[PDB]
Amino acid sequence: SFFTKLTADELWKGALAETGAGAKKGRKKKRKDLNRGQIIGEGRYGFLWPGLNVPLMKNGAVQTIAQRSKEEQEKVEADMIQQREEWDRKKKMKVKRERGWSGNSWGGISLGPPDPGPCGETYEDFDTRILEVRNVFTMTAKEGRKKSIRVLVAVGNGKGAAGFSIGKATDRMDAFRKAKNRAVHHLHYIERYEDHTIFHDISLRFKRTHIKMKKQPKGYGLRCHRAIITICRLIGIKDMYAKVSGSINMLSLTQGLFRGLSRQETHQQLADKKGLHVVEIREECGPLPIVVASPRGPLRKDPEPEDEVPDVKLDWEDVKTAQGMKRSVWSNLKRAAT
């Protein structure tokens, strides 16, 4: 019956069945627009209607109703099927994504520059990296179990400026956008020694996470928790060691890392504070002293106390490694360039 036929919109709605009790709580099909390749006036009889599917005027004479020969129509249908299958194949094929820390992990994956700001502000210089994606659920009074995405992202320009943010959203892409847009308004600035590492060893505890970061020479690489490697590449740090003890909570790790890297005393700050030259003694440069920083104000004439024995609170891991008693089958392994 002609009168019982419906439209493509309604048919696809019913067939796909997106809305429904199943989709209510998750208790596949692809919408193909069948009108894409069709041409007005093209039917299985191969009629050539002047002005609809063929040129109206041919060499100055009004064309007339004609019909393609059977072989010509077969050729046309073959070409149509060829186009259909080419389109389907190009739809099915997918581009290989560049994985982050693992093939199926959102962590470490780039998100691109933060969205441009209103007042002529652009962050093309910044890169964004996902540090975590969670599916947090909250039981609501009416809508049973409610699914949401909490994303942690870190943005940075590779020149010290780096920040991080948490985005909440029902949709993963909205979460990404929220997080990476909020990050750029919460940028730290990290002082890098010689633009490749940190100014001194940093041992800190944020909540139950301990981060022990060691300043390292050029070319040492980033031997850090993978998330710390990502955040350091964003900040602009090339060379550093880092051990994460205690809880490895990603958010506490990120926040404590940023706190430590933001609360570090540069050599100029130390020289100004203690009114003395700060002298670097590199084993590669022999006994040559290298004044890295000098006080802006007057320099103390007092040579500072020479404490015979320091009172520093040493770390057993550092002491054991120095003494060579730490024989771990997992330390100093060979790993890809970081």
Given the complex with RNA, which of 18 and 194 has the nearer CB atom?
18
Q: Are strands 222-223 and 240-246 parallel, antiparallel or unpaired?
A: parallel
Residue span binding another protein (CB under 8 A) among the ranges 1-9, 62-70, 71-79, 290-298: 1-9
Given the complex with another protein, which of 106 and 153 has the nearer CB atom?
153
Least distance in Å: CB of 53 to RNA? Answer: 27
Least distance in Å: CB of 20 to Mg ion? Answer: 8
Q: Which string of DSSP letters, residue by residue, matches 50-97?
A: BTTTB-SEETTEE---EE--HHHHHHHHHHHHHHHHHHHHHHH--PPP
Given the complex with RNA, which of 4 and 64 has the nearer CB atom?
4
Q: Is 163 in the site for another protein (CB under 8 A)?
A: yes
Q: Where in 31-50 is the site for another protein (CB under 8 A)? A: 35, 38, 40-41, 49-50
d(CA 268, CA 294): 7
Given the complex with another protein, which of 84 and 277 has the nearer CB atom?
84
Residues that bind RNA (CB under 7 A): 1, 4-6, 10-11, 13-17, 19-25, 27, 29, 136-138, 142-144, 148, 150, 163-166, 168-171, 174, 177-178, 181-182, 185-186, 206-207, 251-252, 255
Q: Is 26 in the site for Mg ion (CB under 5 A)?
A: no
- Closest C-alpha to 18, from 8, 34, 31, 5: 31
Given the complex with RNA, which of 46 and 163 has the nearer CB atom?
163
Structure tokens, 187: 């940028």
Give the bridge partners for 324, in sequence order: none
Judged by beta carbon distances under 5 to 8 A according to partner kind, the member of another protein, RNA, Mg ion, none in contact with residue 103 is Mg ion
Given the complex with RNA, which of 132 and 239 has the nearer CB atom?
132
Yes or no: say if 201 and 101 are a contact pair by the CB < 8 Å rule.
Answer: no
- Alpha-carbon torsion (278, 281, 282, 286), positive or negative: positive
Sequence-distant contacts of 311-317: CB under 8 A, at least 24 apart: 315/203, 315/212, 317/212, 317/243
Yes or no: say if 171 and 133 are a contact pair by the CB < 8 Å rule.
Answer: no
Give the bridge partners for 285, in sequence order: none
Q: Which residues in this chain contact another protein in the complex, by CB under 8 A?
A: 2-3, 5, 7, 35, 38, 40-41, 49-52, 56, 117-119, 121, 123, 125, 157, 159-161, 163, 184-189, 217-219, 262, 334-337
Residues forming contacts to Mg ion in the complex (CB under 5 A) are: 103
